[PDB]
Design an enzyme around this catalytic site. Structure first.
Site, mmCIF file in Angstrom:
data_model
loop_
_atom_site.group_PDB
_atom_site.id
_atom_site.type_symbol
_atom_site.label_atom_id
_atom_site.label_comp_id
_atom_site.label_asym_id
_atom_site.label_seq_id
_atom_site.Cartn_x
_atom_site.Cartn_y
_atom_site.Cartn_z
ATOM 1 N N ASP A 705 36.670 -27.929 -15.852
ATOM 2 C CA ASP A 705 38.048 -27.434 -16.755
ATOM 3 C C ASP A 705 37.966 -27.252 -17.834
ATOM 4 O OD1 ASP A 705 37.612 -30.384 -16.809
ATOM 5 O OD2 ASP A 705 39.736 -30.337 -17.340
ATOM 6 N N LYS A 774 44.422 -33.998 -29.304
ATOM 7 C CA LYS A 774 43.869 -32.334 -27.718
ATOM 8 C C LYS A 774 45.121 -32.271 -27.689
ATOM 9 C CE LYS A 774 43.582 -35.070 -24.617
ATOM 10 N NZ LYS A 774 44.627 -35.488 -23.599
ATOM 11 N N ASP A 911 44.391 -26.924 -15.667
ATOM 12 C CA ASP A 911 43.148 -26.115 -16.767
ATOM 13 C C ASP A 911 42.098 -26.384 -15.013
ATOM 14 O OD1 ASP A 911 44.841 -24.753 -19.002
ATOM 15 O OD2 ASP A 911 43.454 -26.122 -20.046
#
Lengths: 990, 988
Positions: A705, A774, A911
């Protein structure tokens, strides 16, 4: 426009055709035609339905009677009515002269016979009858040849569609006979449409009270079923009176599903109904969807379409099966096209208002029919009987929609009974056979149960209309990718399942994520006391209780979700199963089963491993170790060599964790993803235990990812040198974490704000961890105007005990703004693209149209935002995330198709890209190549020109469209950074 | 069991509806099942035979008789009469009737005695006697007896046959009374009254007209929905009749379907914006249905016409122009005359009534539908519930609440409809009430009114009343009849001024509610959602508090609007207020909406229609009463108050002439509207050349400071108690409340020294106006939160006082007042503790305390724990016993005043009478109080409790302890009982 009355009358006529009550449809049509105003509401297609229905019962006289009505209305018979009449003429078996006369009358109007048959869709039986009638007449059949399935000529898709000689498609490990047996099991599951799974939670030996509670639950349910049957009969009689009166009725809709099926389905709904409760409108929509699905299954069964599906599916299974060999390897949808299985006419759903009315009637019948005593029948029928379901209004005014809440006593009875049988829908459970190929958007996935391409219910009709407007040639690439994702085989890991079952039965673990039981929950110690009798204190006690009960309620919802997921995992533990994949409006691929899916939870990710097995090879063991380091999250900044060295250093902990997960050092628990780390240690241990690591077969997926996939798309679009370096597009020896830079920029903003009067920065000082930043970055980019995403940032702040929760709400808003400024500063390209996209969206929304764009793969995407008109703030905010989501989905689909040409098994979770450990290197090269190819095309220019075509050429507001044209013309300038560098960058995905 | 009662109630309603074949369908199924046959009772058989007798179908009745024979119990005398009734209709042979009499004689008493033993309908008794006549045995009908009179010494003078009686006669002529009776009869038959709204009606806007048309369409749509739902439920219930199960179909048949449909709509109009409890609504619906059914049954039978003739004969006695040779009490007159007795007066069993009300309420909720009528869309695509159920925190308990949706409320306000519908029971009677011959039958002529207004303990109290000897009941019934006979007229001037203020805001000091009812609150709150999570919650809570405070005003506005509406409807028409008895026995006016007890404004509006001249002392009494209303110079003697009235006479005249624009001295007074009315009556007196010649309609109020405390100080004869409560003669009257306030003040000083800070919070705020309510809560309140809430309400009125500790302050105040009382009066504590201990022990045994008043009407406490309630009985008994004594004293005073000819009514402690009558009423009430306490009430109470509970085998040991407690009665004090007669300050 079309008024609501036509959409109810047409649904009633078609439904009455499906219920063999043509004398009633005739009755209603007679009453409608007789009144002039109702005759205006009557449309030609409704007549073309009534006649066609009479034309199957072998009644030519009534057909010509309805034709007298058609002429009386002044309508001219279309291609449909002429064909229905010809199909009826053959059944009476009158002499060919009549058929020739009908052809002569058709010739007088501007119509043919082959063209008319091609233009208007007809059932296979009725088309055969029409053809036989024509064969009786002098003209020969003269059927035109079919059109070979076309392929996409888009530059991105020309590799996959042009087969050439470089084809190495994969084949399922299971033999052909095993696949056929699995198909028969799935078919049996689809027919009954109810899956019963033993509850995973440990059943205690029943007490005398428990046994009594089960007898109460059995008596009550039986009483509820008798009452439901009586209510259904009364509603059917009243609705039949509405049929005779001449007003739209739901009586055929009730008739389509068997009475016992309706009653049992309603009882099943009650069992599935959570203690928390469900919205009434949502419940009505769900009930209508269930009734439609069970009717489609019944209609396919009686027609005989199911048997043809079995034969076609077995031929299709020959392609997938390893033992069976097909001379020309072809993609699964293409093979199904060669077989030419007939798409069902009934696959299309009912109109949405009619569905809402039917579902609301079923819910209303359920609440009125089901009554139980609050006392739970302990006194001998002296206590008042009160309905199980209770309408609840958040706002007293009738303008707010009411919702439904289950009986408190009933919930207690369910708990006390502790029944081990869990009822699941066939759609809810994963398929036991490979999914049906997605030949069309409307028809795919589950064989008997219709699965529309768009999972989302908001804007479902509009997006589907765009899907059919779009050429089928373009759709095929997305459909092929969805079929490939469905074809991947999943097997539940036994060891991980056993460990989670152990924890789940007794107490569980919070750090691991195993939800706590109700007993563990913080129940209030004492109720209101004599000292607390003061009304102020009693109100405060009720508010604290409301908070405690809220936490307990959430924990029950989480434990119930875990219970369903682990029960399905236990049920499918020994059996290979296939997860079908469906597309949202943005085009991201989501697995169709809601209860059990890999995206939903980390524990689910650990449980699921590929049933198909591929040997590790030379680099597979190293890839497994690198995966293990990635799951822990240690040394993310460090390069892949350092991660491998760390894995060798921590190998003793890895082996000890594998041998004893619970009584061991529990190093896996320390890791960020504990269950996935444990599974990877239980595959690395097996690899080293095996004499040759290359020989060893790794079922477990390895996930690669990018740190942020949206940021890499934005960087690629603007070709920013700084942006590419930040998101690792530029090749580097040491990977650079994009989140760390955002955290540093947020920190300098925090220091500046601390100097300023605002104290939110001071509250957040020392608590702006990288993980929170994040989640915030992902919420800012992928998420648009989401309460849940902001709640997720708030949840991350709550996880830190040291951080005060008094200012968590404003700290989250401050974090969102500082991240939205941080990213815009560090990335020169991203701000320009985002600002242009937002400005274009707001201008389109203000004109009164919703923004529509076509992905580079070819599938149209439309924002489903509706202000109760487009919503100016929602559409302007929504367009950059939805566009970058569509780009990410297109890149993933391209990667999936190319990896399918090489034979790699590829699935995508968020992702992360999941593939076998040996396949990882090839998958990495393919995804870099596809990313470069996708951005090589002028994505921004193509979007600008499509928007100019769609909205700038608008007569209503040319000047605003001119401003839109000017903003669209100023596309961002490409930067110095070379696109080809992405191929050379090993840290693009890691 | 309960189900047998349900089936029997079904059988009785079936006979009236004439659905006897349906009853035969249920009966055969019930006999066929052995268990159901056991459930069938003899009375069920007797019922259907009586119905078969009306139908004439002999063979079904013979089948029922054989079914009785099959059961094996003895055939009862009630059935034989029904068989004879049937035999009469088809002209059967007498010899068989004589054989039927032989069966009746067998296993039964003789023909006269059997007829006396078994109650029968007016038709039935005549049929039984006629059937007896044909047989060779003689009918031998028993001779009637003259009505009994009480032998008790207290009521002996009232029942004395010496011709000194001068009962008052109503001023209105006999013909006018008959016309008023006809108007009341028309009101009773209709059962509803339409009154124009007092509030000013604005010119209707286009939106207002549209809302009215929509309301009309909704109410006619509702009537169609109700009629269809009613038919469907009736069909289902008829299918249940055949199944032999319990059915409510005959109940639904007894009232006409149109009438039921219109009743449901009337209940929707009655329901307010806040909402009413579902169970209470079910009880109200069943009661309304029973009242309409009784009116219909009396109308069809022809009992109504006989009632008209008997009541016109009764009216002749009351009428001044008509002369009756022998003066008699109003009950006594009716007893001597032929009396119509309605068998249907007795109510249906309570569980069946609850079931019927629940069925009607459910039919009302599901049938009616409201979509809010979007004007522009006009599309019916939404959930449409008029009433919505709420959990109200307790969901397991499942208490039912039905509230109308705000959309309905907004529509009702937007339409601004003037017509208001009130029940016939709700409005005051336009004719004198029916004499209280019996406890069950009285007050309204056509609508049954039971003696016990309370629903708690209603069954037990009524059974005790039936158990009690009739004469003891008769004395109280005579007093109630006398109170009803009083005529009331609404004062036009006062009502006009109130209506004008009500139309335009009004005044909080005057108690007038405010129409706008607005409260400052962000109107849209914050347009974007969640500006701050805490602030959002804060504003939401603040808006919820505003909604509650605004709803308070809406309920007050509705109560005041309804009051004045009735006052306007009865402004020009003389009306009579019926009076009933609570469990304690302190009489209450039956009409809820309009009554003198409810509000001070109502007290101002109500004045005697009958007029008595002021006389020499009437003007002085009026001035004294003006001083009493203000509440100033209470400590000062009755002569000083008169001097103050002369001093403030200029203000009195000015305020009466121009209340709105004058000195408004009346507003400053404690009772403003009453003060204003008395100022208009004193002004009218002085304007007239002779005050004695002038006639004062207005009542004069004589009220003791605490009636209960006087009873306590009299029972123990404590000298200190008597002096404080004014029983001992004094030149300067002594106020009990002032002493209580002083003792509370010294306790407050002591507590202030202590750690507790509650006294400091109350420092400087313990005004006598607040301390008065606390004394009334200790002496009269019976574990009532509402009286404590009244104390809290008094504390809130002082702006300076903080409301943060109001709840603790109220608890502290009630405790300190309680602890000031015992030390101040030895006798009061000596009696209160004994009463509180005796009731506690009786509650432990498991019997509710029952005692008989000196007049002789039994009083039983109704409090129940879901058995007697320990924390309720012990606190309840000292006030309930004191209330019973106060009721006995008022009834004695009322009867003796009636003998003299004074018009007497009692509103709480306050005794209301004409200004000339005040002196005579004062002397009479002192005499009756002395006579009541002359009897040894404590000894009589102890002996009766010993008879009721001490002779109990179950727990003799507790009963022995109770016997010891009862034996130790408080000893009489030094203070002489006769002093009360000489004291002119007992009532002032």
């Amino acid at each position: 426009q079309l008024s609501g009355q036509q959409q109810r009358l047409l649904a009633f006529f078609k439904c009455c055709l499906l219920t063999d009550q043509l004398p009633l449809a005739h009755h209603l049509l007679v009453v409608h035609h007789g009144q002039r105003q109702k005759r205006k509401l009557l449309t030609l297609d409704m007549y073309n339905a009534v006649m066609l229905g009479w034309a199957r019962q072998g009644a030519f006289k009534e057909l010509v009677y309805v034709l007298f009505m058609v002429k009386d209305a002044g309508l001219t018979p279309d291609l449909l009515s002429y064909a229905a009449a010809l199909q009826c003429m053959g059944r009476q078996d009158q002499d060919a002269g009549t058929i020739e006369r009908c052809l002569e009358q058709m010739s007088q109007e501007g119509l043919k016979l082959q063209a008319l048959f091609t233009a208007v869709l007809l059932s296979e039986e009725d088309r055969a009858t029409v053809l036989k009638a024509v064969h009786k007449v002098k003209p020969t059949f003269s059927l035109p040849p079919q059109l070979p399935p076309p392929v996409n000529t888009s530059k991105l898709l020309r590799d996959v569609y042009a087969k050439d000689g470089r084809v190495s498609y994969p084949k399922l490990h299971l033999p052909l006979k095993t696949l056929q047996c699995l198909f028969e099991k799935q078919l049996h599951m689809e027919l009954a449409s109810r899956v019963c799974v033993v509850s995973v939670e440990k059943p205690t030996l029943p007490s005398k009270e428990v046994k009594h509670a089960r007898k109460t639950l059995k008596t009550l349910r039986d009483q509820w079923e008798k009452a439901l049957c009586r209510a259904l009969r009364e509603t059917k009689n009243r609705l039949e009176r509405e049929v005779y009166e001449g007003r739209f009725s739901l009586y055929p809709f009730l008739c389509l599903l068997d009475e016992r099926e309706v009653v049992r389905m309603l009882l099943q709904v009650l069992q599935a109904l959570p203690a928390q409760g469900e919205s009434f409108t949502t419940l009505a929509r769900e009930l209508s969807a269930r009734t439609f699905s069970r009717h489609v299954v019944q209609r396919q069964r009686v027609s005989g379409q199911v048997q043809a599906l079995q034969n076609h599916y077995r031929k299709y299974l020959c392609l997938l099966a390893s033992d069976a060999e097909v001379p020309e390897p072809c993609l699964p949808r293409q093979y199904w096209e060669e077989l030419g299985a007939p798409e069902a006419l009934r696959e299309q759903p009912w109109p949405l208002p009619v569905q809402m009315e039917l579902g609301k009637l079923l819910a209303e019948m359920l609440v009125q029919a089901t009554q139980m005593p609050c006392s739970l029948d302990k006194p001998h029928r002296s206590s008042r009987l009160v309905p199980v379901l209770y309408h609840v209004y958040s706002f007293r005014n009738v303008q707010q929609i009411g919702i439904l809440k289950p009986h408190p006593a009933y919930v207690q009875l369910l708990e006390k009974a502790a029944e081990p049988t869990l009822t699941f829908e066939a759609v809810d459970v994963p398929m036991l056979c490979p999914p049906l190929p997605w030949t069309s958007p409307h028809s795919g996935a589950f064989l008997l149960s219709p699965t529309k391409l768009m999972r989302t219910v908001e804007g479902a009709t509009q997006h589907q209309e765009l899907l059919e407007t779009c050429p089928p040639t373009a759709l095929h690439g997305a459909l092929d990718a969805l079929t490939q994702l469905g074809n991947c085989a999943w097997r539940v890991n036994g060891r991980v399942l056993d460990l989670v079952l152990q924890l789940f039965q007794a107490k569980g673990c919070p750090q691991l994520g195993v939800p706590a039981p109700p007993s563990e929950a913080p129940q209030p110690p004492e109720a209101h006391l004599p000292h607390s009798a003061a009304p102020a204190r009693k109100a405060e006690l009720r508010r604290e209780l409301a908070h405690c009960q809220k936490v307990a309620r959430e924990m029950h919802s989480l434990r119930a979700e875990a219970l369903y997921r682990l029960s399905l995992a236990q049920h499918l533990r020994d059996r290979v199963f296939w997860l079908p994949h469906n597309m949202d409006f943005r085009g991201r691929t989501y697995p169709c089963p809601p209860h059990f899916n890999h995206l939903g939870s980390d524990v689910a990710r650990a449980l699921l491993e590929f049933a198909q097995g591929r040997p590790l090879g030379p680099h597979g063991l190293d890839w497994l170790k690198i995966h293990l380091v990635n799951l822990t999250g240690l040394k993310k900044r460090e390069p892949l060599r350092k991660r491998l060295a760390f894995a060798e250093e921590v190998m003793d902990d890895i082996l000890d964790s594998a041998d004893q997960p619970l009584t061991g050092r529990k190093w896996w628990m320390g890791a960020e993803e504990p269950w996935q780390t444990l599974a990877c240690c239980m595959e690395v241990a097996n690899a080293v235990r095996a004499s040759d690591p290359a020989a060893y077969v790794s079922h477990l997926p390895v996930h690669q990812d990018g740190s942020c996939n949206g940021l890499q798309h934005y960087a690629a679009l603007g070709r920013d040198s700084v942006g590419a370096a930040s998101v690792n597009l530029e090749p580097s020896d040491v990977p650079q974490d994009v989140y760390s830079g955002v955290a540093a920029q947020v920190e300098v903003f925090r220091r500046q704000d601390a100097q300023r009067g605002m104290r939110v920065a001071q509250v957040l000082e020392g608590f702006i961890t990288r993980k929170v930043v994040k989640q915030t970055v992902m919420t800012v980019v992928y998420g648009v105007t989401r309460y849940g995403g902001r709640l997720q940032i708030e949840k991350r702040l709550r996880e830190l005990s040291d951080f005060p929760q008094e200012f968590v709400w404003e700290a989250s808003h401050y974090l969102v703004r500082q991240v939205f400024k941080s990213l815009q500063e560090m990335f020169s390209g991203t701000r320009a693209i985002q600002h242009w996209l937002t400005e274009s969206a707001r201008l389109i929304s203000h004109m009164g149209s919703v923004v529509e764009w076509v992905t580079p793969l070819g599938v149209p995407v439309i924002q489903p935002y509706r202000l109760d008109k487009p919503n100016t703030r929602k559409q302007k905010n929504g367009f950059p995330p939805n566009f970058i989501h569509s780009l990410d989905s297109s890149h993933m689909m391209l990667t999936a198709l190319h990896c399918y040409r090489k034979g790699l098994t590829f699935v995508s979770v968020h992702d992360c890209y999941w593939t076998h450990a040996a396949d990882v290197s090839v998958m990495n090269q393919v995804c870099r190549e596809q990313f470069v190819r996708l951005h090589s095309e002028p994505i921004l220019q193509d979007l600008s020109r499509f928007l100019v075509k769609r909205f700038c050429s608008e007569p209503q507001k040319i000047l605003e469209a001119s401003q839109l044209k000017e903003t669209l013309q100023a596309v961002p300038k490409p930067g110095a950074f070379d696109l080809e560098q992405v191929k050379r960058s090993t840290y693009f995905f890691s």
